[PDB]
Every structure is written in structure tokens, then in C-alpha cells.
């Protein structure tokens, strides 16, 4: 009997367009099907619309798009997990699979013009309302402002209808207010448990007149180095001029949450030409702490608290840099991107995330496997270095350790890491694999891609398979489905792919086929892969000055500035003096933060592959149910371990 397969996202979202790809294998003729959704438990009949018929001309393919209504029954309970039932009626065959339903229904981004506000001054913040697809949406937003001790002071109830997703709001701080770290928190009406927040502080400040940046030569301190830590002070006026003053430097060890100061490291270096340097002899660092041991200092950190004073004795600026690590190794190895399951007798990919000790990705550092060290590669601009190891067709797990092989360094300084990968497990030990080898480079929208489908099966069953089914995730929901044909005998099939601007920032690709094997038992083999895309705006907004002459405009003199953006869009602007950024540069907003939030809000957390087909689909964030009885695992936790 032909098998009917329904693929839906593993987590559903209220008030959103969620697709449900309907596919049938070996179907004969037109097979109409109506999809219905029922609450669990009970039967509340939330939605049973969007029925679709199937056609053999379109390879029995079809996707239904709808939106789960938001009712008080879902909002009645907010502290426990809730589920719904999706049921499909493939003619005379019935299939139904339960699925978890979350309460997230969009994102909130809070932009404040400044980051520090004096008492008695106004506050201007904008609330951005976007959905799971990062589009303007009309909802209801609650806004609250909380003082540092945790007491709401002002609450509102706005609506994003007719505002095109931008809600400008203002608030007036009383002239007599307890200073500290104020907080602004907002949440959607449907999901009061989901709280978004920003942080702005109230201070008794006056704007400075210059910026001080302390940049050590290397973002670390080698423990065995004899010269010691070197830090360079670069004091520059805000309006692009150099400083002639004097500076004070003090070095302290930051272990845990307790800061230990070094009285003997204080120096008075005269900054000249907007530059200066100061040394820290290793003897001072060793003797400052009680224990003269060396290895105990590993894991701690240093911080520089530089104070700069002009020769005129007018203004003082305190600039602090903290978090410089004390690590015996100038490099770090991470395996957050490498798949945890390989395929026996099949090429295996090893994405190594080589990064600087502070956390920033490294660049152009060689890496190599310990065994058969002839394999070498260099990290790209993103801090990821490709690797390739040939895997023997043995069911025994394989252990891989990688070690950087940069020259001019000893064997002790190179960072090491060890990883254990489990072999892919089939059904009935039929030795049926699928692998998907794909380019993983600094991909950009528009540039093409070449997915390499690599089937591996015995010649007795190489003719039953006649196609492939592949899906593309993006931001938690599907983006595109399709069938890639494969005539018998063609071992390798290439699938051209169009990476548009909608694939930002990381699309997860899955692929699977099906046939009858063993002694008449239906089975499925699947695969998944993780691909990165350049993090940039879906559109293109650029701000540039129209006036190309009359350098350094006089105050009070006009200029014209162009806004190059996509047509029909709404642009919000804000001009901020750089003094406040000198005195506070945290809790801002940028494209990187937005993409980090979107990536964090994903549904799967295993970069490709898995223990088995059910594991692969569960990790990829999809549930797969068949008419025959084949099914994936069960997901009942919002946050993966």
C-alpha cells in the first residue's frame, strides 16, 4: 500500500503562517486530503480548513498554509506545556500526530536614543514589533519601566495597528529619583510570560570632552612570557584631534566576582601625540598575589583602569578594559558546529571553531588532525576551518582530536581538544546510508550552491529509488520544498540551489528518500546539514552625506544626507553625541544582536545528522508521520538540553 507522509514543524506558533508539507509515495491518481487541527485534550475544532487535492503530475506534492487562532483556552494556562493534534484524512486513510505549541508570537526590539539619562530629563524609546518572519505586525504591546530595586513605576497599553510596526513613546524621569540600573520591559498580550527587556542607567554625569581606548597588543597574557603584559593608551578628542596630557594606569587581577588590586603596578606615563605605553613586569604580577605558583593564575583575568587628565587640568575620564584572559595557550578549539554523528565508510566533515581566548573568532591559523597530519587547513574570515577525514566502514566509534599547528610556537602552546562521534544507525541493520556533502563558505544571498546527494546502497536496490525529497528550514519554519529526480544508475545527483535574501542567517537543509527493503518492511533514511549565510540586512539601507565638499561643517551650517533604502519602507532616525557612548557603550542595538536573537529562538540545536532518522528529524526541528506507522520521536520540552 502507498504510504502517506506529513511533515510539520516540531514547534507551532500562535498567530503565524505555518506550513505543513503533504507528500505521498507510490500514490495512484488524485488523492484529496483535508487537514484538521484539534486541541489536546478534547476536541475544540480550532481549525479544519485549507484542504488540498493531490496530482500525479506534480509528483503528489502539496503544502497547506493556515494560522492557528489565538483563543482564551490557550491563554488560560501559561505555566504548563500544551499540545494540539493535527489530523489528515488521506481519502480512506487517517493519520494524526500530536505536536507541542509554544506561546512565542514575535519579537520586541527596544531602541533608546541615549544610554545614560540625568534626572529631570526626558526618555524617548521606540518599540519595534516584528513577527517570527521578521515582518511588521499589528498586535498589542504592554510596556513597563522598572527601577533597579524592582518596582514598576509606569505602565502603558499600546497598539501597533496602523503604525507599521513602530511605536514611539516618551517618559519623563522625576527630578528626584534613585539612581542605578533602570530597566524597560515589554511583553506581548498573548504571552505575558515572555518578557523582553533593555537596560539604561541614570547617572549624575556631565559629558566628557574626549575618548580613551586602552588596546593591549594581544588580547591575552602568556603566563611564561618574561616581558609581561603591555597596554597602549590612545587618547583622542571626540572631534578627531590628538591629546596632550598625563595618564594613570593600575592593573588588577579579576578572579570570579572579586577584584584584587596591585598597588605596585601604578605608573604615571606621560601620553604624547595621543599615544603612550606602560609595561607590567611579570615579577610584580607574581608577587602581588599571595600564591607564587604559576598554574593557579590560569583561568583568572586582568583589567586595566586607565585615568587620563589633560595638561590644563580641566576634565578627567576613567576608561576601563576588563576580561583579558590568562591562558597558557594563545588559541581555543570549539566543536559547537561539528556534527556529532558521522556515516561509516563515508567522508566526514569537521568544522572547527578556532577562536581567540577572549571569544572573538581567529583568522588564518593552521589546524590539523593528530593522526595522518598531512591534512591541513586555514581558518577563513569567520573563524571556521574546513576539514575532511576518510572514515573506515566500521561500526566502532571513531575518536578525533585536533591541534593547531602554527609555527614559531612550541608543542605546549598549541591548543588541543578531543571529540567522540557516534556512527549513524540504520533500521534493521540494512546498511542504507545517505550523506549530503555541501560547501560551507562565507555564502551570500544570490550566489549559487551545489548540494551533493551521495546515495550509498547495494545494486539490488539501486533502481527502486527514483527521486529525493528535500526541505529548507529558516527562522523555525519551512521555506521551500521540492523533488529532485534521480534516474537509476546515477550514483551522484547535484541539486542547484538559489540562495536569495530570504535565507538569512542559517538555513538547515534535510533530505530523505524511501523504498521497501528487508522482507517487506517499509523504512525511511534521512539526513540533515547545517549551513551558514552572511549576516546582513534583508534589505539594504545606507546613510551617506550628499554634500561632498565643505569639509568639517561649521556648527549651524546645514548638510543634506541621503537615505538609500528599499522603496515603500519606513525609516526612523536618531542622532547621538559620541560623549554618551564614551561614558557608556553597552546595551545598544545592531544587526548582530538581532540575528543572535533570531538564531537563539530556533527550534533545533544539533548541527546536522543524528542517531537515526527519527533523531535526525527531531534534531532538525521537524516531526515526520507516515500512514504505515513510521514516526519520529516525541518532543515535550521548549528548550533543548
Amino acid at each position: 500500500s502507498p504510504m502517506y507522509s506529513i511533515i510539520t514543524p516540531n514547534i507551532l506558533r500562535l498567530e503565524s503562517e505555518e506550513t505543513m508539507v503533504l507528500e505521498a509515495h507510490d500514490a495512484q491518481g488524485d488523492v484529496p486530503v483535508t487537514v484538521t487541527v484539534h486541541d489536546f485534550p478534547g476536541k475544540k475544532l480550532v481549525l479544519s480548513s485549507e484542504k488540498t487535492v493531490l496530482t500525479p503530475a506534480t509528483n503528489h506534492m502539496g503544502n497547506v498554509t493556515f494560522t492557528i487562532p489565538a483563543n482564551r483556552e490557550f491563554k488560560s494556562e501559561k505555566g504548563r506545556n500544551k499540545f494540539v493534534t493535527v489530523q489528515a484524512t488521506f481519502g480512506t486513510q487517517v493519520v494524526e500526530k500530536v505536536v507541542l505549541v509554544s506561546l512565542q508570537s514575535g519579537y520586541l526590539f527596544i531602541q533608546t536614543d541615549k544610554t545614560i539619562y540625568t534626572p529631570g530629563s526626558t526618555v524617548l524609546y521606540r518599540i519595534f514589533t516584528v513577527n517570527h518572519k521578521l515582518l511588521p505586525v499589528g498586535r498589542t504591546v504592554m510596556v513597563n519601566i522598572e527601577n533597579p530595586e524592582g518596582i514598576p513605576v509606569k505602565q502603558d497599553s499600546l497598539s501597533s495597528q496602523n503604525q507599521l510596526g513602530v511605536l514611539p513613546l516618551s517618559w519623563d524621569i522625576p527630578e528626584l529619583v534613585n539612581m542605578g540600573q533602570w530597566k524597560i520591559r515589554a511583553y506581548y498580550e498573548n504571552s505575558p510570560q515572555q518578557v523582553f527587556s533593555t537596560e539604561f542607567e541614570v547617572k549624575e554625569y556631565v559629558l566628557p570632552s574626549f575618548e580613551v581606548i586602552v588596546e593591549p597588543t594581544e588580547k591575552f597574557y602568556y603566563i611564561y612570557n618574561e616581558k609581561g603584559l603591555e597596554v597602549t593608551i590612545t587618547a583622542r578628542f571626540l572631534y578627531g584631534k590628538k591629546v596632550e596630557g598625563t595618564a594613570f594606569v593600575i592593573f588588577g587581577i579579576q578572579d570570579g566576582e572579586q577584584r584584587i588590586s596591585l598597588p605596585e603596578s601604578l605608573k604615571r606615563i606621560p601620553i604624547e601625540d595621543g599615544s603612550g605605553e606602560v609595561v607590567l613586569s611579570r615579577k610584580v604580577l607574581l608577587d602581588g598575589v599571595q600564591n607564587p605558583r604559576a598554574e593557579d593564575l590560569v583561568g583568572k583575568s586582568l583589567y586595566v583602569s586607565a585615568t587620563v587628565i589633560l595638561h590644563s587640568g580641566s576634565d578627567m575620564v576613567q576608561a576601563e578594559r576588563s576580561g583579558i584572559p590568562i591562558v597558557t595557550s594563545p588559541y581555543q578549539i570549539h566543536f559547537t558546529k561539528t556534527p556529532k554523528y558521522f556515516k561509516p565508510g563515508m567522508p566526514f566533515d569537521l568544522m572547527v571553531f578556532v577562536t581567540n581566548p577572549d571569544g572573538s573568532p581567529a583568522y588564518r591559523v593552521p589546524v590539523a588532525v593528530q593522526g595522518e597530519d598531512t591534512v591541513q587547513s586555514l581558518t577563513q574570515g569567520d573563524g571556521v576551518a574546513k576539514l575532511s577525514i576518510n572514515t573506515h566502514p566500521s561500526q566502532k566509534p571513531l575518536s578525533i582530536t585536533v591541534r593547531t599547528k602554527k609555527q614559531e610556537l612550541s608543542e605546549a602552546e598549541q591548543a588541543t581538544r578531543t571529540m567522540q562521534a557516534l556512527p549513524y544507525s540504520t533500521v534493521g541493520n540494512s546498511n542504507n546510508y545517505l550523506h549530503l556533502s555541501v560547501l560551507r563558505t562565507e555564502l551570500r544571498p544570490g550566489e549559487t550552491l551545489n548540494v551533493n546527494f551521495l546515495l550509498r546502497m547495494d545494486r539490488a536496490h539501486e533502481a527502486k529509488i527514483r527521486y529525493y525529497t528535500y526541505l529548507i528550514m529558516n527562522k523555525g519554519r519551512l521555506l521551500k520544498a521540492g523533488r529532485q529526480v534521480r534516474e537509476p544508475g546515477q550514483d551522484l545527483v547535484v541539486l542547484p540551489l538559489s540562495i536569495t535574501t530570504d535565507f538569512i542567517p542559517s538555513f538547515r537543509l534535510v533530505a530523505y528518500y524511501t523504498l521497501i527493503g528487508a522482507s517487506g518492511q517499509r523504512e525511511v533514511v534521512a539526513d540533515s546539514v547545517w549551513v551558514d549565510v552572511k549576516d546582513s540586512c534583508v534589505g539594504s539601507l545606507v546613510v551617506k552625506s550628499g554634500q561632498s565638499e565643505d569639509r568639517q561643517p561649521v556648527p549651524g551650517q546645514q548638510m543634506t544626507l541621503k537615505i538609500e533604502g528599499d522603496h515603500g519602507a519606513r525609516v526612523v532616525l536618531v542622532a547621538v553625541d559620541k560623549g554618551v557612548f564614551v561614558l557608556n557603550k553597552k546595551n545598544k542595538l545592531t544587526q548582530s544582536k538581532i540575528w543572535d536573537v533570531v538564531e537563539k529562538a530556533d527550534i533545533g540545536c544539533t548541527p546536522g545528522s543524528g542517531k537515526d532518522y527519527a533523531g535526525v528529524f527531531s534534531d532538525a526541528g521537524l516531526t515526520f508521520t507516515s500512514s504505515s506507522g513510521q514516526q519520529t520521536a516525541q518532543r515535550a520540552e521548549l528548550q533543548c538540553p
Binding site: 489536546f40 485534550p41 504548563r80 493534534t85 500530536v98 514598576p152 522625576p174 514516526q631 516525541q634
Partner: protein
């Protein structure tokens, strides 16, 4: 201030498929129905297994479809069509259908006809109910196996059966209040002379369901408890658990929260999971009582405050209300003087 419930880590055995005649059909489907009701009310399907719910629903749906064959043309039910209709079996059908109205499409006409058939000729004018067809196996009726005060307990059970389906067939049957009054008078007349805590508990539950269990009857009910934590009967402990479930349901109806927690703690202490011969009714109604502990579960909060302030300026006296949903609703007000 509410005792914990069963985690259902060993409740998977309650899924028994219907088989055989109507009696065996109901014996098989009773644990499954009561288990799915308990799981739905407790919202414990996450740990019990989400995929078994659809299978259990299909099981109960096809069992409900199959049992309709045994229905007599007079809207009556029995083990076999040839066999005479049984009053207790019909009351049990009423219980099951009124419990499963939310899960299966129960025919309202069938239940209304059954209730009318029971009222018109299956009861005495005084309200006493008579059993015109004993079931094949006496182990499933529960406390009616013993002949002592059998008619009184049967009358109390049928009174509960008719009182638990008030809104189902209120308009169709107009003689229901008369039967209710007759049964209540009959039960209250002979409540003191009861010697079995099973009969005492069932009579107390029936009388408290409509409010006639007051004064000396309530005092006798309270004193019926053994060591103030359990109900005891001669014989096996199954009758003790049944009487405890009777008392628990009666107390939940009476909304007396100072004595329920010991009862539910004791019931969980024995951990009566059911199974075996002559245990369908006891397991069914003990899980039913556990379910009635849920949904309408008493909670410690009684937040209905009405807060008002007398402003010295007297421009506007601010008044608000604090409730359970607004327990953490912090209110900030500022005065300049």
C-alpha cells in the same frame, strides 16, 4: 494546601480493549475510560505518553459503537438482548455515558429514554428502586454482592445516577423532582439504623448531593470515619476503599476542606492501582474521586480585596481590587505632599 496526585508511572495497565458481551465490554472499557479521564483532568499526558491518547480514544469510540447493539428497544441495556434489562446495568450505563459525553457523541435521546424507562416503571412509588435482572457475575456490582441492606444501597446508587445527569434530560422528564424527593425521604428516614460504613457512606453521598445530609446525619457521617483517616468495612479492603471514595466525593460536594486531605493522602498511601477480579467498580470510582479532586481543586488563595484610599486633596479617591490573577500586580502611587 492541596495534596499531591498520582504521577501515573504505573497506570499503563488500565488500557484494556473491549471484548465479549456487553458485561465484558464494559469491564474492559471501564479502566481505560477512567484512566483517560484522569489523565485529561490531571494534564499528565506529557509523562504518560502523548501517542497513547489517540489509541485510547479510538478504543473507547469503537467500544461505544459496539455496545449500542445490546440496547433494548425500550431504551434499556442488559448483558444480552434476550436477557431482561438490568436496573443497575442501566444506571451504570447512565454513569458511563454522562461521564463520556465530552469524549464521544452520546445520543441524548437514548439516555433520555433510558432515564424515563427507569423512572416510569423501574422504581416503586415510594422511590425505592428494584433490580429486575441480576447480572451474571456478582463481583462487578461491588457492594451489592452482599445481601444485607442491598435494596437501600441500590436505591442510593440509582439516586446518585439520576442526580448526576440533571441537565442531560431535564426537559424530557418532568417526574424527576418527585422521584428525587421520594428517594431523599426514603434515605433520610432510614439513615440512622445503617450499620455498614459502605451503606452509610453511599447514603451520605446521596443525601449530601442534594442537601438533606445535615445535623444528625452529618454527625453520623463524620463519626463513621475510622481513626479520622479512613472508612472500614468487614471483608476485603476493596470495600473499605469504595467507602472511602464515597466519603471523599460526599465531602467534596459539601466543600469541607478540613478533612479531605487526610482522606486523599490515605487513598494515595494504599496506591490502589486496580486490576483483578471484582475490582472494576472500586478502581473506577476511586480514580473518579481523584479526578474530582482535580479541575475544581480547592486552593489556598481567597484574594478578593477591595482597596481604596482617601486622598488628602480629595480630587479623586483611588479604588481598586486585588485578586488571585492580580496577586503580583504591584501598584505605585505618588503624592507630592
Amino acid at each position: 494546601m492541596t495534596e499531591d496526585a498520582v504521577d501515573a508511572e504505573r497506570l499503563k495497565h488500565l488500557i484494556v480493549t473491549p471484548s465479549g458481551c456487553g458485561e465484558q465490554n464494559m469491564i474492559g472499557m471501564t479502566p481505560t475510560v477512567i484512566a483517560v479521564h484522569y489523565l485529561d483532568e490531571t494534564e499528565q499526558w506529557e509523562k504518560f505518553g502523548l501517542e497513547k491518547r489517540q489509541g485510547a480514544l479510538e478504543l473507547i469510540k469503537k467500544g461505544y459503537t459496539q455496545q449500542l447493539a445490546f440496547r433494548q428497544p425500550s431504551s434499556a441495556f442488559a448483558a444480552f438482548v434476550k436477557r431482561a434489562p438490568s436496573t443497575w446495568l442501566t444506571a451504570y450505563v447512565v454513569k458511563v455515558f454522562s461521564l463520556a459525553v465530552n469524549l464521544i457523541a452520546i445520543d441524548s435521546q437514548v439516555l433520555c429514554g433510558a432515564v424515563k424507562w427507569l423512572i416510569l416503571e423501574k422504581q416503586k412509588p415510594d422511590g425505592v428502586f428494584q433490580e429486575d435482572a441480576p447480572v451474571i457475575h456478582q463481583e462487578m456490582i461491588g457492594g451489592l454482592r452482599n445481601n444485607n441492606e442491598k435494596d437501600m444501597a441500590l436505591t442510593a446508587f440509582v439516586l446518585i445516577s439520576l442526580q448526576e445527569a440533571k441537565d442531560i434530560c431535564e426537559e424530557q422528564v418532568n417526574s424527576l423532582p418527585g422521584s428525587i424527593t421520594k428517594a431523599g425521604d426514603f434515605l433520610e428516614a432510614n439513615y440512622m439504623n445503617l450499620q455498614r460504613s459502605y451503606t452509610v457512606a453511599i447514603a451520605g453521598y446521596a443525601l449530601a448531593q442534594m442537601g438533606r445530609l445535615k445535623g444528625p446525619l452529618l454527625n453520623k457521617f463524620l463519626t463513621t470515619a475510622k481513626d479520622k483517616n479512613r472508612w472500614e468495612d468487614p471483608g476485603k479492603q476493596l470495600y473499605n476503599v469504595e467507602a472511602t471514595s464515597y466519603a471523599l466525593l460526599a465531602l467534596l460536594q459539601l466543600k469541607d476542606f478540613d478533612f479531605v486531605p487526610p482522606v486523599v493522602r490515605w487513598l494515595n498511601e494504599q496506591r490502589y492501582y486496580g486490576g483483578g477480579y471484582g475490582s472494576t467498580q472500586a478502581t473506577f470510582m476511586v480514580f473518579q474521586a481523584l479526578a474530582q479532586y482535580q479541575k475544581d481543586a480547592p486552593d489556598h488563595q481567597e484574594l478578593n480585596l477591595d482597596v481604596s484610599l482617601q486622598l488628602p486633596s480629595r480630587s479623586s479617591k483611588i479604588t481598586h481590587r486585588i485578586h488571585w490573577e492580580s496577586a503580583s500586580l504591584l501598584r505605585s502611587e505618588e503624592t507630592k505632599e
